[PDB]
Amino acid sequence: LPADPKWELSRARLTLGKPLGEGAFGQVVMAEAIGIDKDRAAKPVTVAVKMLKDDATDKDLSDLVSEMEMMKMIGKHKNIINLLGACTQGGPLYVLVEYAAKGNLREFLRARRPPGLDYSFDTSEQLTFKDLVSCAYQVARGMEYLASQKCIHRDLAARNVLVTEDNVMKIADFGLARDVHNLDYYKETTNGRLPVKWMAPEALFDRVYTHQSDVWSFGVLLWEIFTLGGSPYPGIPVEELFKLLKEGHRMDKPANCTHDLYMIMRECWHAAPSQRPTFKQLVEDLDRVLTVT
Numbered sequence: 071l072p073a074d075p076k077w078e079l080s081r082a083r084l085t086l087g088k089p090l091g092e093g094a095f096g097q098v099v100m101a102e103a104i105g106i107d108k109d110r111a112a113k114p115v116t117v118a119v120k121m122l123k124d125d126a127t128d129k130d131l132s133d134l135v136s137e138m139e140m141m142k143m144i145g146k147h148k149n150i151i152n153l154l155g156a157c158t159q160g161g162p163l164y165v166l167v168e169y170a171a172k173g174n175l176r177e178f179l180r181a182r183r184p185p186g187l188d189y190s191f192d193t194s195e196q197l198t199f200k201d202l203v204s205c206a207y208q209v210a211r212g213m214e215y216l217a218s219q220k221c222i223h224r225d226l227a228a229r230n231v232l233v234t235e236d237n238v239m240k241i242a243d244f245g246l247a248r249d250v251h252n253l254d255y256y257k258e259t260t261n262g263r264l265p266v267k268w269m270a271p272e273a274l275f276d277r278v279y280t281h282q283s284d285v286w287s288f289g290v291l292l293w294e295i296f297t298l299g300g301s302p303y304p305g306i307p308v309e310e311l312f313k314l315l316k317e318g319h320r321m322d323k324p325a326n327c328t329h330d331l332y333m334i335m336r337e338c339w340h341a342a343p344s345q346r347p348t349f350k351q352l353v354e355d356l357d358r359v360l361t362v363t
């Protein structure tokens with residue numbers, strides 16, 4: 071594994087801590103990192119360390135490397151999870167990223183659903199319409215930046231948006247992200263995980279991804295936000311989801327969602343990718359919704 075001194079942090083500077091979250095092949099743990107902050111007086115930075123699980127393969131490893139490399143070219147933005155460094159030498163690969171205290175967006179929204187009339191929870195503030203639109207607006211801003219970096223995310227979803235102590239949204243998980251520089255589109259040529267319920271039709275059969283296929287995913291994300299962590303196309307087998315999408319089926323309007331937002335959501339889900347709004351447009355339309363509320 072080739073060294074990159076620019077990003078390398080020696081693992082002796084790193085003390086591993088409590089678990090943050092995980093999935094099938096990767097896990098993320100809290101840690102303390104010494105030397106990240108240039109102010110030497112007050113220290114050490116709390117970071118999140120992403121690493122492979124024990125049953126992970128060589129393929130999982132090269133995917134985590136690619137993920138790390140993608141974050142290197144991206145550039146820093148308020149609404150994008152920050153790469154802080156990496157331990158690539160003499161030990162397991164650790165990818166160091168900015169710590170988001172409030173976990174992922176899906177779990178953040180779910181923990182704020184009300185109990186229902188006549189019921190109370192017993193042990194752990196309600197979100198407003200404005201809070202939720204804010205969430206949408208912040209992600210749209212980060213995606214707008216991401217597209218200007220000529221990078222497509224391909225896995226935009228509530229489970230991949232993080233929340234800081236200040237309720238700032240940070241897009242995370244660049245596992246499927248691709249460099250689209252000097253490309254009109256990206257064409258998938260392998261087999262690997264696909265986030266089916268978040269994928270535009272054209273991505274699902276032509277295996278063709280653009281910024282516009284990311285916008286489709288944002289639309290699904292919108293639906294997640296306004297159902298406070300709902301799971302897309304509930305009760306629908308995947309094999310059929312796709313005939314349904316062809317036939318012009320789209321998800322119904324969530325109960326919290328206003329008409330204006332559902333139209334925004336619906337525009338993202340246009341059959342023709344050229345008729346979906348750009349992220350820049352999405353930032354505009356969501357700023358408006360927010361300016362007059």
Ligand SMILES: Nc1ncnc2c1ncn2[C@@H]1O[C@H](COP(=O)(O)OP(=O)(O)CP(=O)(O)O)[C@@H](O)[C@H]1O
Nearest residue numbers: 090091092093094095096098118168169170174243
């Ligand atoms: N910087 C961070 N700060 C706090 N928590 C984080 C974090 N990064 C990730 N997490 C937590 O770990 C979970 C999984 O993160 P991530 O999406 O990066 O891994 P992953 O989806 O690639 C695992 P797999 O590929 O095995 O399915 C997140 O949903 C979140 O709960």
Ligand SMILES: [Mg+2]
Nearest residue numbers: 093229230243
């Ligand atoms: Mg993820």
Ligand SMILES: [Mg+2]
Nearest residue numbers: 093096243245
């Ligand atoms: Mg992953």
